[PDB]
């Protein structure tokens, strides 16, 4: 490590370690910026030498880390915890935590290259017989056929090409961040990822959320299995067991809003997709970006800077140049860069991931001028949430109206229940899947769920939450859950559960704050000055306090809370229940073992 | 409750505090007695006016529980926890936990009529053709001796059906129930009571890590049997990369697999270590069986049966007809005069050991009977559930049984030591999945993570996960597979076996030792040594009255439990096994978790 990065001696006492922070704080800069950096070259452009170079930029951070976090225990490891400054404390048990850092040189390599490597596998993956990528092509494919034969194609496909070669280096990486995190004191990786939220009864807390929200999933699952049923037939559809993976729009089956116009009860009322709308008049990805932008700004937050658009990729490049197409956002922590890295495509519901990524912008850009390690959502689930609410505001008619993406709708019955069906199909239907990822890999750090069952306790939970089946028989050989991004990619997961809660929090606060007074599913808050203050007021905060003090600041509440989820959707949770009682429905899949037979002379 | 049954005046203070324990526990016999008589009565004879009496009984022990429950939290509920005498700590402690006493009258009659009717469905169900089979003997006997997979399919499916399908609505309002009483004794959920009886921290976590010890031999033991049993149903019916079907080990749970004991035997050209035979051909009875056992208790210088166990027990299913609980259970009257066991006694070798298991109850009460009340019981459930066992691994050793003519030929050569350590694997490791499993189910339903809408779910990933069986049918949630084993709709916690288990090998190399014995471990026969017995003795006699981890450490010279002496028994087949499956080829473990076996051609026709 170059000499000016590493630590100077500072007096072992509260004002040595304010100094301590300080000259911390100034080199992590240099070190955080030549690692984001040496990640986007890799990213943007997946070869080789940029794997290289990645590889060397986190060993450099490793040794950063590891000189810093020595000395913070050298000089304050008995005295931190009294420290009378809480944002002081709150840094220096963090450069205490040295994570992969306490690994031996050697197997610090080892840890960066299967990072590399499995980045590589899951970006790159094919599925042959000309070949297709993921995105866009198996996505469009699981978004629009409604031929079961070739939407089996595309999921066993893509869950065998990903999954597969990805499991022998998953194995060794679970071994390898065990061993860095236990020697900070954790019993396994996932409980230090847990450790982010600062809560003691953080499971329990997620488990009684689950329990609150369950009923709004099971009805909306019954309801769009009937739809299944009569879409594929009895021979493809068990109206009282899970729903096949590959039928509900989705890769992941994660959220249902591709398969809308199978399930919208009024289709005669105008299309809420308004996806064939934007390629009628022309959008293209920059488009849709400013119109993210022009939202944040209307409420005063900040514009995007020249260097956002200038350094970002926010199409898929067609030099063949092979890409990470993931949509992510990224601060390089230098105050000036920030980007987005997103294979945009034009429909409506990439507009909301744009707004999401541009979520992260904005938080980078007001937390921006705080020290580095307080550069950080008030938790990670805060981080996920801020374009979302804003997209809440988007996805109304009566916004879609504003900006020419809709003739305006008539403020009727079969209208709001057709809007809130769709909006449930995006966030309802996702919320198993939020809950369940982390479960699946807490078991796997914990040693719960060794190699021999990552498939077998995988789909138990698919299973057991999200009430799917896999369409083809799998067994271990498989790794079905390499063959989502997060899992090769080692991006934690409960934040999206967590945001896609904390959402409708932010949602009803801004709401109040804005003035509003309608229902809270009808609510924009376009150009309500006083809402983006109250917003402007969290993302400035990063993390430099508790995201309960946070959150009681921003909507009253100290506390993750569903009520506002629940009354966002109150009225089709009840037209659901109706619908599903006429219909007879069973709630739930209690034929659990029911699996879907194969087409015939399937694969051909 | 009757006035001489009611909690007199005491002290708020620890002097006082002993004084009313005293007095609790000399009115607490009364109380005990007629309720196990008013149950032996019934499970010896199921009708509905001795299951009215025996209701009405559990009525009279929930009022007397409640009065002096009331009485301890009166007087000493803030202070008890500091008492300077642990042995008080521990009985104020146990009557201030009211249970089911702590129920609403209305809802103590809803639990015991729960649990009345849930005993008397599950030990009357019967799979019929007019002609009806119950599971003991008549489904036992196909498990165990029927090799046509169709034969064992109609029974398993007829019995899993008959028992599991109508006992689910009453075990989920009995859950509620439960749990309402307990967590008015401040415990989370009854599953969290139930563990609280082994007085651990760190009981879960102990648990894992003697599981992740024994895995490995239950693996290997596995690849082996299903490879044997593919040789004989052929790979439309075992698949050597999938789960076992569960009907096809011997047993109508897969718990124990000796009733395959000659398919996997390794070599068979030593002698027969399976004397059911013998047995049979010698015109052994369930009185010869439990004078056998009798006899090495006494050999022991233990105690032997008073006349009240033999001219009280049912040894016996009854040929009158009559309905009756026969699952083998051993019976404390609380008098310190009667002591019963209720067994329908088969005559197969693994019925002698099921005798010996039962008279290693009785041992213990015969043992602590001049205790107080509430110190009868074992240091922890687990000792209970071990001592006859432990005996039972001297009996069943070649050099014993030929002792007792089950076995003319003896023979000491490696091969016979494969033979016999392999049939005791079949017994004893076999077992350890499924005696870990099930109160991981149930504490999962107690807990709520299982909710009725998943109960067999559950059930299934969990036999799957750690037992590496299937179902040989298809399963809904209809199916209410976990009632169709005893200990569920009889409220019997289970983990008391996962520990019996290994701890019996643990006494069983403490108590060879103390024989002098110097051979290998599983050779040991402690057949007539008195200095084991006093040993034993020494156990039997402090029923809870010390924490088992002291009682333990005097024991075997450790205070915890201890894979190594399970281990250290069954090492040289452990390695054989491992050999073995590496030279056949195995793959260890069942990844297709997903495999189920097809059906029969011509189901059920
Ligand atoms: C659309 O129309 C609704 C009213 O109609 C409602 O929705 C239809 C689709 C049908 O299902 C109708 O049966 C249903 O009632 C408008 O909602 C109403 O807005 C007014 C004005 O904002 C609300 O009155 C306010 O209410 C609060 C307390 O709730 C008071 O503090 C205020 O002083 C004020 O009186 C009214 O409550 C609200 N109704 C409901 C059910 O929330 C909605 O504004 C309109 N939106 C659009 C975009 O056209
Ligand atoms: C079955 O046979 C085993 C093995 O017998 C041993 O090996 C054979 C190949 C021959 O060489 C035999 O002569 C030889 O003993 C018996 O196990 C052995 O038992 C003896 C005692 O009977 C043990 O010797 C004692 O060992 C202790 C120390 O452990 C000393 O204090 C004693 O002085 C004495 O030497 C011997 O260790 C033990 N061997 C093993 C490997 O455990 C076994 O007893 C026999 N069983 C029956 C039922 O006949
Ligand atoms: C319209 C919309 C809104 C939100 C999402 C969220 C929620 C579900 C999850 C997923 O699609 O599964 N999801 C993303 O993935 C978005 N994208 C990232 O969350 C990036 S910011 C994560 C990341 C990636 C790489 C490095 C660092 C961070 C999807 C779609
Ligand atoms: C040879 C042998 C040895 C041990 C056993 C044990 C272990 C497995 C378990 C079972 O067979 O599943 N098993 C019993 O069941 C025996 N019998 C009871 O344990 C009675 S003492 C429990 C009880 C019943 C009713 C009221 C109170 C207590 C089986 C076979
Ligand atoms: C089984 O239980 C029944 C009661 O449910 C017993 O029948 C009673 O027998 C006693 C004598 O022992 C009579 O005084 C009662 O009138 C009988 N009652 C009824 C309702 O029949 C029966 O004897 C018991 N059988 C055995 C073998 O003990
Ligand atoms: C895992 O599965 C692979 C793919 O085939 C699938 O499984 C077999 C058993 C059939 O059911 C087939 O229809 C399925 O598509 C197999 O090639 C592979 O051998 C299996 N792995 C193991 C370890 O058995
Ligand atoms: C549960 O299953 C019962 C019968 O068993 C199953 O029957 C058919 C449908 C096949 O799946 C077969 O392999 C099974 O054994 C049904 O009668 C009952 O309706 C099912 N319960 C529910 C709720 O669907
Ligand atoms: C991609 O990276 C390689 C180094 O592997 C570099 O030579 C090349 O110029 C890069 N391509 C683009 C388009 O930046
Ligand atoms: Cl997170
Ligand atoms: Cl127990
Ligand atoms: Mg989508
Ligand atoms: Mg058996
Ligand atoms: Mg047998
Ligand atoms: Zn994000
Ligand atoms: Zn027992």
Redesign the interface.
Request: charged fraction near 30%; proline fraction near 5%; avoid cysteine.
């Given at each position: 490590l170059d000499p000016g990065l590493q630590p100077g001696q500072f007096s072992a006492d509260e004002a040595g370690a304010q100094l301590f922070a300080q000259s911390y704080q100034s080199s992590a800069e240099q070190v955080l910026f030549q690692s984001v950096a040496a990640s986007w070259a890799h990213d943007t452009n997946i070869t080789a030498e940029n794997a290289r170079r990645q590889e060397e930029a986190a060993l450099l951070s490793q040794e950063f880390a590891e000189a810093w976090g020595q000395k913070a225990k050298e000089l304050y490891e008995p005295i931190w915890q009294q420290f009378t400054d809480p944002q002081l404390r709150r840094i220096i048990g963090a450069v205490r935590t040295l994570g992969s850092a306490n690994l031996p040189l050697a197997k610090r390599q080892q840890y960066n290259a299967l990072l590399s490597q499995m980045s590589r596998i899951y970006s790159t993956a094919k599925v042959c017989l000309t070949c297709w990528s993921l995105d866009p092509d198996l996505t469009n494919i699981l978004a629009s056929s409604r031929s079961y034969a070739m939407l089996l194609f595309a999921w066993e496909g893509w869950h065998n090409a990903a999954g597969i070669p990805l499991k022998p280096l998953y194995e060794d990486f679970t071994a390898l961040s065990n061993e860095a995190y236990k020697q900070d004191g954790f019993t396994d990786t996932g409980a230090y990822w847990r450790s982010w939220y600062n809560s003691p009864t953080f499971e329990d807390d997620l488990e009684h959320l689950y329990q609150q929200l369950e009923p709004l999933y099971l009805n909306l699952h019954a309801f769009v299995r009937r739809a299944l049923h009569r879409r594929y037939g009895d021979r493809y559809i068990n109206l009282?067991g899970p729903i096949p993976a590959h039928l509900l729009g989705d890769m992941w089956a994660q959220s249902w809003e591709n398969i809308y116009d199978m399930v919208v009860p009024f289709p005669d009322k105008p299309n809420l997709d308004v996806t064939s709308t934007m390629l009628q008049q022309g959008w293209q990805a920059t488009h849709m970006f400013r119109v993210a932008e022009e939202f944040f700004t209307s409420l005063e937050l900040s514009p995007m800077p020249p260097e956002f658009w200038e350094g970002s990729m926010l199409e898929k490049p067609a030099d063949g140049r092979e890409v990470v197409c993931h949509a992510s956002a990224w601060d390089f922590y230098n105050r000036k860069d920030f980007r987005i890295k997103q294979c945009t495509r034009v429909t409506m519901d990439q507009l909301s991931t744009v707004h999401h990524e541009m979520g992260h912008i904005q938080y980078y850009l007001q937390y921006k001028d705080l020290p580095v390690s307080l550069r950080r959502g008030a938790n990670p689930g805060f981080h996920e949430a801020i374009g979302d609410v804003l997209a809440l505001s988007v996805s109304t008619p009566e916004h879609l109206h504003k900006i020419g993406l809709l003739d305006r709708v008539t403020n009727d019955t079969e209208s709001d229940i057709n809007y809130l069906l769709k909006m449930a199909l995006e966030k309802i239907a996702f919320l198993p899947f939020g809950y369940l990822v982390d479960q699946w890999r807490w078991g796997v750090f914990s040693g719960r769920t060794p190699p021999?069952?990552y498939?077998?306790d995988w789909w138990?939970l698919r299973?057991?939450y999200q009430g799917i089946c896999p369409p083809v028989?799998?067994?271990?050989?498989h790794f079905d859950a390499g063959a989502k991004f997060h899992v090769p990619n080692v991006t934690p997961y409960i934040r999206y559960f967590v945001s896609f809660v904390l959402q409708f929090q932010f949602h009803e606060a801004l709401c109040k704050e804005a003035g509003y007074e309608g229902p809270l599913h009808q609510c924009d808050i376009y150009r309500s000055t006083k809402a983006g203050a109250k917003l402007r007021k969290v993302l400035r905060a990063g993390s430099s306090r508790p995201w309960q003090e946070v959150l009681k600041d921003m909507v009253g509440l100290d506390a993750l809370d569903a009520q506002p989820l629940l009354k966002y959707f109150q009225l089709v949770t009840q037209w659901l229940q109706e619908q599903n009682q006429q219909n007879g429905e069973v709630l739930?899949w209690?034929?659990?073992?029911w699996?879907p037979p194969l087409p015939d002379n399937y694969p051909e």
């Open positions: 009282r021999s069952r498939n077998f138990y299973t057991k028989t799998r067994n271990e050989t739930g209690p034929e659990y073992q699996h």
